[model samples]
Structure formats: structure tokens, C-alpha cells
Target: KLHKEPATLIKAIDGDTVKLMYKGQPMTFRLLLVDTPEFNEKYGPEASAFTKKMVENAKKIEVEFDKGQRTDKYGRGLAYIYADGKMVNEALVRQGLRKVAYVYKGNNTHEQLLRKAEAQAKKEKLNIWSED
Candidate 1:
């Protein structure tokens, strides 16, 4: 199941969410297994900036889904975003700017990697883990 759909970024809504041009229509994507602060929150701007920078620099962007459900209750597509061959979701966590949360059984596919990144982030006391 090595399926990946190509897409272009319309804009990053935040660190963990983005609006993309997929299949000729604009769609919202919520990063699975990770969470970032709101736009007005403490680390929110930095988080969003990181995502923006990475996506902006990416020559190719793609998104993939897990086994089961695809969207959240709000109908935003839940996916693992990839940019230039790297998983941006996990990267955000690894930078200690995002936290691993909202895990579901079906979407536990990349949890191992995400958790490892988070563990390293915490151990290094980076960003959000710096003081608390």
C-alpha cells in the first residue's frame, strides 16, 4: 500500500493543518498523530513558520492516509504529509514544536516514528519541552 497522492500547498493553516490543492480542488488536511498550538498560542507562530518554510522549499509534496477513516469530524482530511521525501508531521514533532496526540487505532501506522521523535525532543528539552 505505497500509495501517495501528489498535491500543492494552497497555504498552511497552521503547524498541523494546511489547505492544499488536491485533484483540482482546494482541500484541508489535518496532520494525523500530531498537534500544534493555535495561531495565537505560545509556539504557534514558530510551528506554522516551520511548516511554511518546509513546504515552501519542497519541490514535491504528497499526502497519504492510513487504513481506516480519512477525515475528522469537521470533515478535514486527515493525512500524513510528505515534502521532498520527508514526513513533515514527524519532523515537526522531532523539532519539539509539536506534540504527538490524537492517536486512533487505525492511524497508529506512523506512531512509532512520531513517538521516537517526540522522545528525543523531550530528552533534548526542545521548544515546548524547554520549560515544561
Candidate 2:
């Protein structure tokens, strides 16, 4: 468990990338198992804003890491972040803010959860589906 919550969302680099303040350090997270529309794509800004709102200023976030794969080629720690006991990655998918996208080959517990969440989000018509 990390001592600090994501204190702030520094910026939204794109629909899928964000800079967050973690434990007083600026950490960049490329949300795993999900890809929102591009910034210029349909509903892209809304998806980005939704993700920013969900993670910004969130406290007491827990990080679950994959031991063998610590960071991506860009040197960002590849991790699944849990805030308030919910998987932040999956939450976005569940809210229809993003679509499930798998990267790399390893355990996929997080991916499975995201899929389930996405199903629920679709059923509920959370975001894009709601507009449709």
C-alpha cells in the first residue's frame, strides 16, 4: 500500500495518458487494459476529462505491481492502481470512458475485471453508449 493518494492530476497528455502526483512525486501512468478515443476523436475530450476527474486528488491509492515487468520502455512503472478499494483502470472502462485494450503477455486479472466492468457500463449506458 502506498502512503499517499494521487494528490493531483498534473495533466492529461491524451485520452489515455495522465501525469499524477504520487507520494509527492510526479508519476506518469499509461492506463492499462484500456484505450479511450483519441483527443480529436469523437467524445475524446469527454473521456479524458472523465478519467481526470476520477483519479485527480484521489487519496490512499494502492498500487499492485507485476514483479517481472516493472516499467515500460518509456520508464514508467506499469501498475494497476486501486483507489478507495476500486481498480481505477477498470472503473474508467466500467464508466464507458475507455475501451479494453491488452498490452504485453502476462497475468490478466485486471483485464478480466475491466471487461466485466465494461459490460456493466454498456448495459447502464454510462457515457458514449448514453449518447448513442
Candidate 3:
């Protein structure tokens, strides 16, 4: 239940990073609860491509929190991104483009949903699990 704000994506920084222009200012955000491959890691290209497609399909992009506790040590917004009515963070994992990763103790952002998505993906042996 957030007041959705439309954002113009300036850059899709790899798979999990996005840069946008919001309220006439540039902002970068890291997708929460999932981690795609790094540029040098396996499946990096595929992950990056999938993210680009997700961003391209959204009519409205929302980054709520109204600047409240919005960033981490890296200064990137640590928030959920809603695009085309889908939570892009969970979307990536559910579609098998990324994996649930970097979980910190006590951080409870979409923990349950993300876990379920990853489990389903693994059961299907999708992308990250396909080579088995």
C-alpha cells in the first residue's frame, strides 16, 4: 500500500541495480532479497537481460518509503521496486534470473514472498538450477 510514483529509468545497472530519475533527481536502487550473477560470474548476461525486460514493460515504477530509511552503506535505495504491478525484486527470483541472497539477520523485507519464489524456481530447475 504505497503511493506509486512513476520513474524514468536512466540505467539498468546490471541485473540487480537500477538507476532512475525521480522527482527530477537521480536515484539508484538495489533490488531487495535477490542477487543475480555479477558481471564476471555465471549467467550474468542472462540476468541482466531479464532485468532490462522487466523495467521496459512497466508503465509506473514505484519506490516508496518517502526517503525514510531508504538506503544502506552503499547509498543505494534499499527498497522494493514495483513495476507493472509486480514486485520486480521477487519477480527476478521467481523467473529464475536471480537467487535469494545476501540475507542479513533481522532484515524483514519481503522475506516470506522471496523465499517462496526461490523455492518454486528451484523445484522447477529453472535457470540458476537448470544445469543440475
Q: In model 3, which runs have C-alpha deviations exceeding 4 angstroms?
A: 1-4, 36-40, 65-69, 104-106
lDDT ranking from best candidate downward:
1, 3, 2
Q: Report the backbone clash tally of model 3.
A: 0
lDDT of candidate 2 vs native?
A: 0.66
Question: Which pairs clash (backbone N, Cα, C closer than 3 Å) in model 3?
Answer: none
Give the top-scoring candidate (lDDT): 1
User: Cα deviation in Å at residue 112, candidate 2?
Assistant: 1.4
Worst 10 residues of 3 by lDDT: 63-72
Q: Give all candidate RMSDs, comma-separated.
A: 2.3, 4.0, 3.0
- CA lDDT of each prediction against the hidden true structure: 0.87, 0.66, 0.76
What's the best-to-worst order under TM-score? 1, 3, 2
Look at candidate 2 and tell me the lDDT of residue 100. 79
TM-score of each: 0.91, 0.69, 0.82
Alpha-carbon runs more than 4 Å astray in model 1 = 36-41
> Could you say which candidate leads in TM-score?
1
Clashes of 1: 0
Worst lDDT window (10 residues) for model 1? 35-44
Model 3 RMSD vs true structure: 3.0
Between prediction 1 and prediction 3, which has the larger TM-score?
A: 1
